[PDB]
Amino acid sequence: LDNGLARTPTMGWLHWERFMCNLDCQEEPDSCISEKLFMEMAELMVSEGWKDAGYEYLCIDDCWMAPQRDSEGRLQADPQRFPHGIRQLANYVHSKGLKLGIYADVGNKTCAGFPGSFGYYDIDAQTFADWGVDLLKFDGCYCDSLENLADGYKHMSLALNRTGRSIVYSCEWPLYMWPFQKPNYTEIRQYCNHWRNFADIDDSWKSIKSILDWTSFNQERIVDVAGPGGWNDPDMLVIGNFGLSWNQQVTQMALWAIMAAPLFMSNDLRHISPQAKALLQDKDVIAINQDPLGKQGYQLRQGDNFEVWERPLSGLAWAVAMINRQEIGGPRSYTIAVASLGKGVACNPACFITQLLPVKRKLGFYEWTSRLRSHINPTGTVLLQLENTMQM
Amino acid sequence: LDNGLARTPTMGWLHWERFMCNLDCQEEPDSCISEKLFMEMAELMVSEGWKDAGYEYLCIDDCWMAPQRDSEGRLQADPQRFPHGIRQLANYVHSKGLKLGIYADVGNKTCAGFPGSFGYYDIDAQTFADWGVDLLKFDGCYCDSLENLADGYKHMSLALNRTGRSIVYSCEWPLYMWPFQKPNYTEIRQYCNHWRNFADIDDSWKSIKSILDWTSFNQERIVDVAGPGGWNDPDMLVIGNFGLSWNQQVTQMALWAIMAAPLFMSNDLRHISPQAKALLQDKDVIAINQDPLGKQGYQLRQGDNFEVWERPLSGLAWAVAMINRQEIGGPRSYTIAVASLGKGVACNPACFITQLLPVKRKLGFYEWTSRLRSHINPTGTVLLQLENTM
Ligand SMILES: *[C@@H]1O[C@H](CO)[C@@H](O[C@@H]2O[C@H](CO)[C@@H](O[C@@H]3O[C@H](CO)[C@@H](O)[C@H](O[C@H]4O[C@H](CO)[C@@H](O)[C@H](O)[C@@H]4O)[C@@H]3O)[C@H](O)[C@H]2NC(C)=O)[C@H](O)[C@H]1NC(C)=O
Ligand SMILES: *[C@@H]1O[C@H](CO)[C@@H](O[C@@H]2O[C@H](CO)[C@@H](O)[C@H](O)[C@H]2NC(C)=O)[C@H](O)[C@H]1NC(C)=O
Ligand SMILES: *[C@@H]1O[C@H](CO)[C@@H](O[C@@H]2O[C@H](CO)[C@@H](O)[C@H](O)[C@H]2NC(C)=O)[C@H](O)[C@H]1NC(C)=O
Ligand SMILES: *[C@@H]1O[C@H](CO)[C@@H](O)[C@H](O)[C@H]1NC(C)=O
Ligand SMILES: *[C@@H]1O[C@H](CO)[C@@H](O)[C@H](O)[C@H]1NC(C)=O
Ligand SMILES: *[C@@H]1O[C@H](CO)[C@@H](O)[C@H](O)[C@H]1NC(C)=O
Ligand SMILES: NC[C@H]1N[C@H](CO)[C@H](O)[C@@H]1O
Ligand SMILES: NC[C@H]1N[C@H](CO)[C@H](O)[C@@H]1O
């Protein structure tokens, strides 16, 4: 989408994975979808260094609207859970130096059953623009056919442009194209800033395995289309919750950096361990994800329960991730010819290698003929930056 | 097994899950199956409070033997990886105040392909006794028929008794009896101190889920036979390794306590976090697991992606575990009528409830009419002790 936005993968916070559609504000006040939740989350994004690290977009997922539209036929926020309205929430978020994302659906209803946008694309686009929305996640539930789906997505894109406001457009279009047909990713990139490809993520290592395996299996279809202005979305970051071990959290961070993925945290910033905060705020790994070249990485090797991924970076630098998929035993040894890395350019004539995950450690100079030796934890990942150099 | 042993579930350390069959002592001297590894683990079991917590048995799994038997036809440890022999290793372990477990197989070969004990049951039993072995894990690979399997397990049991040495006898008989026929668990308890029921564990929440589900699905068959001298073995504790989140480790600890399971750590005691060390050395949870009454807990309730297990304890006390099996969202609320717990006697007329996991916290007094409300983390478990007001 050529709207000047998402020149690097969008960074922020989305409530869906962690808070879901909790409507019971009387019995579960701390987890229900309310304006107080988003206000407190914005406060913590500022105070706890999340904005400094790059997380800019505070995003509302499903279950923010009233059961029906107002008298004029416009979307209205829920009266009890959002008394002061989306405009006042956007004002608050902007006053903290952040940006506000909102949710809508292309069909007649949202996935949770709230008013859909079909028939009101222009009305809803102008409503979001007036409220001060900076990002729109557009879902695909309750849609008849591919004609309706495609037309709705393209229509909402053009309507948002016609509002004249800069609004990041996050689509779920490709994901909703199966079981009908394989998406034309060029068409989708034409209209979307990023697009969800695969099923929703949950708080489990199984889910990350599934997302990564699907991505590596379909990488010839989706890697080259990604770039500044249009990204593949493998869904939210679940670091800081309950289902991932430390090494699995490291794996998700490293490979979301490799995949040039939008970094949308879905956690409770009020209850997050120092470990997970440091991982999610890792300056070097975020720098990899935010590389100005904007070239998505890919799976280089796969076998012996090992995976090797790499991502090209600006200035002849490369990121390399090595995953141990063996879920038994201990740290497993892996060696690779340094010339096999970075298409043979990362370490020609030499490269300086810096391990970034699980710990940061300078590994030294590697000649084009040398071999890299590493040990990877079960379900863990070793992330490295290779800086091309002529010294040595 | 009425040999006076395993009156509480056996506690110790087994190398299999974490170290497997690592024979590459040239490239990984510190991780290969060698007497140096077991010496380091014994040293740390003393130094780091593991013996104090109750972990007593330092056990050797497969891949300790030489490729073949000696002149006399006896088992021998690997010459290079175990230079000083099992007897001297046992002497060292005993000098540290610990006990030594060894591994053998009922069939023609061990699962890794090393000398089996079929045909040598008496010889091998007497050899282990001479060496000073205090525990035998008996595997079931490379076995012709169910008859050979059963006969071998009973034979080795009786041979160990005839050596005159107190040796804890750990069997894998039930695991190798399915899917051919259902094991007679009374028969097995007659010959074994504990017995492996289900597939091997690995460093994954999936493995723990499968073990728990199998146990609850077959609980009508296996719960009542367990007791002092004979326990169900859901395989090793993998807390402290790589595949489990904190809450999944909490779940494993709590429900291995509920299940009156042998507590066999399989980890690297040289590199273990303070968190996992504190969980594995939890005094109250170990006390639950080591409850002298020896009544195995069971799944009381299952539904809404929630699980409720409970175990009767000594002195009219009860342990209650609540699992959240929903792997998405956040801490989920669960409420239960306190009268529904402990067969309806735990809190009649009242009970004091103490949460032990994930954190220790006094919850106060609960009348027989009260409801217990809790929030359980996804894939996590809340463990509670109920003390009746008497
Ligand atoms: C509505 O849609 C139209 C297109 O249908 C869209 O117009 C496009 O806007 C982008 C972004 O402003 C334009 O790209 C810029 O072009 C100018 C002129 O050449 C350059 O100065 C810009 O370069 C800077 O920014 C780039 C990042 O985009 C960097 O790569 C560069 O190094 C500079 O820093 C940039 O190339 C584009 O030309 C137009 N296209 C058309 C056909 O008009 C408009 O922005 C949309 N509006 C809304 C509100 O959505
Ligand atoms: C061999 O088996 C006998 C018979 O089961 C064991 O004898 C029992 O030992 C316990 C020890 O506390 C006593 O409480 C039982 O009363 C004994 N039963 C009988 C019938 O004698 C004996 O312990 C076993 N010995 C070894 C070395 O395993
Ligand atoms: C399981 O095996 C046990 C013994 O191995 C069986 O119990 C024995 O049954 C015989 C039958 O005459 C009695 O004489 C013995 O006294 C019993 N021994 C014990 C220790 O109970 C038992 O019946 C078998 N179970 C099933 C279901 O067949
Ligand atoms: C919404 O419902 C109307 C009335 O049944 C139908 O004509 C229309 O196609 C629906 N919209 C979508 C996007 O399916
Ligand atoms: C994809 O869509 C674009 C624009 O809609 C079009 O130019 C292109 O031919 C399409 N590709 C395929 C393979 O249909
Ligand atoms: C071991 O092998 C021999 C020869 O093949 C066979 O007769 C015997 O039954 C086997 N024993 C077991 C326990 O498999
Ligand atoms: N893919 C289905 C989508 N619908 C949910 C909101 O109802 C989440 O936004 C999810 O991303
Ligand atoms: N059930 C299979 C058994 N065989 C392995 C040793 O080779 C482990 O002891 C495992 O417990």
Numbering used by the authors:
A (entry chain B): 32 to 423
B (entry chain A): 32 to 421
The publication says:
To unravel the binding mechanism of iminosugars with α-Gal A, N-methylated derivatives 20–24 were synthesized, and we determined the crystal structures of α-Gal A in complex with compounds 4 and 5 at pH 7.2 and 4.5, respectively, and 8, 20, 21, 23, and 24 at pH 7.2 at 1.97 to 2.61 Å resolution.2,32 The structures revealed that these pyrrolidines bind to the catalytic site nearly in the center of the TIM-barrel domain of the enzyme. The bindings are primarily stabilized not only by hydrogen bonds (H-bonds) between the hydroxyl groups of the compounds and the residues D92, D93, L168, D170, E203, R227, and D231 of α-Gal A but also by a salt bridge between the endocyclic amino group (endo-N) of the monobasic compounds (pKa ∼ 7.0) and D170 of the enzyme at pH 7.2.
Previously, the dibasic iminosugar and potent α-Gal A inhibitor 5 having the (2R,3R,4S,5R) configuration pattern demonstrated good chaperoning activity in cells transiently transfected with various mutant α-Gal A.23 Notably, iminosugar 5 exhibited superior pH-dependence in its inhibitory activity compared to its monobasic parent molecule, 4, suggesting that it binds to α-Gal A at pH 7.0 more effectively than 4, leading to better enzyme-stabilizing or chaperoning activity. By contrast, the corresponding C-2 hydroxyl group of 4 forms H-bonds alone to E203 and D231 at pH 7.2. This finding most likely reflects the stronger binding affinity and better protecting effects of 5 toward α-Gal A at pH 7.2 compared to those of 4. In contrast, the titration curves revealed that the endo-N moiety in compound 5 exhibits reduced basicity (pKa = 5.5) compared to that of 4 (pKa = 7.0) due to electrostatic repulsion between the vicinal ammonium cations,34 which implies the formation of an H-bond between endo-N of 5 and D170 at pH 7.0 but a salt bridge at pH 4.5. Given these structural findings, it is conceivable that the pH-dependent protonation states on the amino groups of iminosugars and ionizable residues in the catalytic site of α-Gal A regulate the binding status of the compounds, i.e., the stronger binding of 5 to α-Gal A at pH 7.2 is due to the formation of the BSBs, which are missing at pH 4.5 when the binding is weaker and only H-bonds are formed.
